[PDB]
């Protein structure tokens, strides 16, 4: 089945940079739909990028455009988040996620135990 793991998070000062990484099993990654998906406490969750294997595009949160970049090592089937220029408002549970892409759902489906970034 879809499993996914993330790492990398942890305490990070303000305005600094830190990178993600999920690493899958049980799954191509071009079969699915893939990203990342925050979340902190009292705050509905966020979707953070979205990438689709139907034309290659990957769709960003307004809040992290131009701060954040995702991105995939097909072979190694392992997806990454590269944050940069952090600020207090992006701490929460970072969790990558997927759906089988299908074009019923995005980045939903299947989700890991997440990563904790709280930035100073």
């Known amino acids: 089945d879809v499993q996914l793991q993330e790492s990398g998070g942890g305490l990070v000062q303000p305005g600094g940079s830190l990178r993600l990484s999920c690493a899958t099993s049980?799954?191509?990654?071009?079969?699915?739909?893939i990203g990342w998906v925050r979340q902190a406490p009292g705050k509905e969750h966020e979707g953070v990028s979205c990438?689709?294997?139907?034309?290659?595009?990957?769709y960003y949160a307004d809040s992290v455009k131009g701060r954040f970049t995702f991105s995939r090592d097909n072979a190694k089937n392992t997806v990454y988040l590269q944050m940069n220029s952090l600020k207090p408002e992006d701490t929460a549970v970072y969790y990558c996620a997927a759906s089988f892409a299908d074009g019923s759902s995005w980045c939903y489906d299947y989700w890991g135990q997440g990563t904790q970034v709280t930035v100073s």
């Open positions: 049980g799954f191509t990654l071009d079969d699915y739909t």
């Open positions: 990438f689709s294997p139907s034309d290659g595009t990957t």
